[model samples]
Target: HHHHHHMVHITLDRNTANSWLIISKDRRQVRMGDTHQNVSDNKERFSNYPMVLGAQRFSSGKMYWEVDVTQKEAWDLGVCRDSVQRKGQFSLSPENGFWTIWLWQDSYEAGTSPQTTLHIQVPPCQIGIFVDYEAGVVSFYNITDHGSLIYTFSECVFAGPLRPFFNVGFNYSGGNAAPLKLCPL
Candidate 1:
């Protein structure tokens, strides 16, 4: 059975996005641009990282979302706490409120303290993320392969509302300009 039944509409929160990221007006897609956009500084905005948070927040229950990473070479997708650091330096690990996975240097890895390298036979073009707040778990699925699970962060510490996290990695010499999209279910 398809997992679309648990899908929830999600959009990027402009206020929480970094100036270097270009979030679409519809807020469903994001990409890294060459120049920094002129935006006012705020507590929610990420000044150091090219990342963004979803507008929708989940405090409890099960929630699911999908992202289209088609041609994107590098990106990050997962969930993070509302109070997660948005400025300066920070780790993208569960201990820091970021339960995420990333594709970088042509390698896939879970955002663990020491980073868990994934050995997927084929890279996923689209990914499905499911979060069970009360159960304290975050799971990632390879939607390109019959929704097979890729990884899971178990026994998570969800202290408050959590938001969908996105990171459009640096535009690597025009090799990674493809935008990251939020797939509509």
Candidate 2:
């Protein structure tokens, strides 16, 4: 429920992308693909789902970005440390360096220590995330409708530069096959 300005521009990091993920030439859109690629499964690559990190990183000051999960059925978007594990199944918790919101099973949840259950509210098509690094705050907003504040992570400790992250879930087929686009200001 706050008005903010745009100072930062975030783009999908292709180097950190999984094989099933397709990044557009502009680097703003990230889509989940059903077919496989011949790329090596490097350590930076995610073997799990349609996941990727932002090429941009922030270590201090206030930063903001938006994501358009739109028609996707299941997706997750937020910020994570550069050192956040790219392989293996890890908890999407702050201690593990993941602070994001998830849209799964047609429901929303804050990916906290153990994951916080949210109300039965309709998931927003467009999402905004604002981070006050010095203040240790990460606030998520629903910009599709009323621009209401959705969730926040307060008193978060940063290990290094935090990067924008997104996931279209493990299932890359059907309605969830669309891209998880990072919007520009």
Candidate 3:
């Protein structure tokens, strides 16, 4: 048994309406991503997915944090780069882009199984996340400026559990684009 005692802290004083954190262990950095539904409805309903933001290791069996919405709704913040079938590099452009941060506006009763729900969840008032990687630290903001704390997670430690390749994106379920910003620390 080995416990790596390391800590990383992140702070966000910007506006975050619907957003998520994407981390690349290979790059030792974190990026901000959102969903489409949340950007369309202009609400923060689908912003909490179990796997939205946290420390992830791209090896076998690594410890990480996921925004679990078992009690709420299931939403798709973005697809992992390795999970998507497309053959092009996904762009992180905040505007005029394909995928970013989005939300789940529909009810789970609309023939939407938890396993097939592709929207982010709201509620819980969690202040995003605070990740402390061995290389650096990262944080996610709501970007709404509604004075809501949103989601907050920090002091993450990775211990080889799962090896997965992922990326972040957002789409408008039925409206305009949802703009966001990403900062490095």
- Full-model lDDT for every candidate: 0.89, 0.82, 0.28
Among these predictions, the greatest lDDT belongs to 1
> In terms of TM-score, which candidate is strongest?
1
lDDT of 1: 0.89
Clashes of each: 0, 0, 55
Candidate 1 per-residue lDDT, tens place, 97-124, comes to 9999999988999999999998777789
Candidate number that wins on TM-score, 1 or 3:
1
Question: Tens digit of lDDT per residue, candidate 3, span 1-185?
Answer: 11112222222211122234433434333334442323332232124321232223333222222232222222333212222222223333212111223234543211111222322254422213333334322233332333233322233233322122222223333231222212222
Q: Estimate, for each residue in 1-185, the C-alpha lDDT of model 2 and write its tens digit.
A: 65358447788878899997878999999876778755777889977667888899898888888888778778888899999987777778899998898988878999987789876365688898998989899888888768788888998997799998888776634667778877767
RMSD vs true structure, all candidates: 1.2, 1.6, 13.9
lDDT, model 1, position 19? 85
Please tell me which model should have the higher lDDT, number 1 or number 2. Answer: 1
- Residue 88 lDDT, candidate 3, scale 0-100: 25
